[PDB]
Amino acid sequence: SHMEEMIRSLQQRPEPTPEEWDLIHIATEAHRSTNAQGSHWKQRRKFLPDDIGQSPIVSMPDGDKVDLEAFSEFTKIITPAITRVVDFAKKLPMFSELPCEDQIILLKGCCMEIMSLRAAVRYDPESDTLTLSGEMAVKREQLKNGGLGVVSDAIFELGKSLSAFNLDDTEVALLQAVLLMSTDRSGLLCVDKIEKSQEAYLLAFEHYVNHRKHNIPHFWPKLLMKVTDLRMIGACHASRFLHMKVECPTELFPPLFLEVFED
Ligand SMILES: N[C@@H](Cc1cc(I)c(Oc2ccc(O)c(I)c2)c(I)c1)C(=O)O
Ligand SMILES: N[C@@H](Cc1cc(I)c(Oc2ccc(O)c(I)c2)c(I)c1)C(=O)O
Numbered sequence: 503s504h505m506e507e508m509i510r511s512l513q514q515r516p517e518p519t520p521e522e523w524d525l526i527h528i529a530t531e532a533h534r535s536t537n538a539q540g541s542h543w544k545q546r547r548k549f550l551p552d553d554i555g556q557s558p559i560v561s562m563p564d565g566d567k568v569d570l571e572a573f574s575e576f577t578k579i580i581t582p583a584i585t586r587v588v589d590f591a592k593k594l595p596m597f598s599e600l601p602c603e604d605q606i607i608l609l610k611g612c613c614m615e616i617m618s619l620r621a622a623v624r625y626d627p628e629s630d631t632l633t634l635s636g637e638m639a640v641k642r643e644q645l646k647n648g649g650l651g652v653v654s655d656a657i658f659e660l661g662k663s664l665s666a667f668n669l670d671d672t673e674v675a676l677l678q679a680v681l682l683m684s685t686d687r688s689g690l691l692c693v694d695k696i697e698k699s700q701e702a703y704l705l706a707f708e709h710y711v712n713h714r715k716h717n718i719p720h721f722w723p724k725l726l727m728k729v730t731d732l733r734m735i736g737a738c739h740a741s742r743f744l745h746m747k748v749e750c751p752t753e754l755f756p757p758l759f760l761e762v763f764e765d
Contacts, residue, residue, distance in 0.1 A: 529703070554575060
């Protein structure tokens with residue numbers, strides 16, 4: 503119609519449908535309500551003491567040793583972080599309608615990818631830090647030494663690169679939904695349904711990116727490459743986590759940390 507054309511005049515690319523907007527809204531709010539500190543993180547966060555995370559002392563196969571005190575500081579806050587990822591997922595109808603067993607497999611599969619993304623989007627260029635759970639600002643050396651090794655470097659590089667993308671809450675939430683609804687896991691019951699849901703999220707996300715009209719070119723494929731980086735981060739972490747368990751006693755690992763990162 504005449505009105506439709508007028509308002510779509512500076513549009514070419516497909517916008518989200520009404521159905522996709524509903525999808526977008528629900529996921530955005532699911533993320534906002536489960537993202538620690540929300541909009542206030544920069545003010546409310548405290549730096550991890552400079553004297554912590556400078557003392558790698560426990561051996562690892564790749565030679566990047568672990569600072570036990572720093573590892574402990576990190577693991578002490580990881581349970582509420584994992585919990586919020588579970589909280590986010592439960593708020594998406596296409597996730598909550600899956601069998602309980604599939605939900606668990608999907609959460610285990612994407613948990614590090616999502617937490618890494620949530621750290622990365624809170625990279626602060628001025629202090630050169632990530633913020634963990636909206637409350638703990640950490641330097642590259644600290645996060646490296648406290649257990650992550652080269653995974654820290656990868657997350658910092660992702661965070662630095664994401665600054666220019668200027669992602670909003672919706673884009674972060676849709677990335678999380680896409681990571682969550684991956685069928686690259688063993689033992690799933692409802693593979694076709696999960697794939698259909700990821701396809702629905704991907705198309706809604708592509709259309710939202712169109713709606714946003716970012717100033718950087720090739721935004722959509724660029725964002726997809728970032729998903730691939732997040733996958734590599736998740737994989738490197740899973741491998742390193744196996745080594746952590748070989749080296750250190752169970753008592754240093756919070757129960758949920760152990761459960762979610764099971765091989
Ligand atoms: N910042 C995120 C939560 C988040 C919390 C923590 I502790 C993180 O560090 C990790 C992760 C895995 C590990 O094995 C180790 I050792 C340290 C990261 I990366 C992210 C959020 O806002 O939800
Ligand atoms: N179900 C799929 C959906 C999906 C499919 C494709 I093709 C993607 O682009 C890729 C993938 C791997 C690469 O090496 C490169 I370069 C680009 C992405 I990002 C996601 C998934 O969850 O990955």
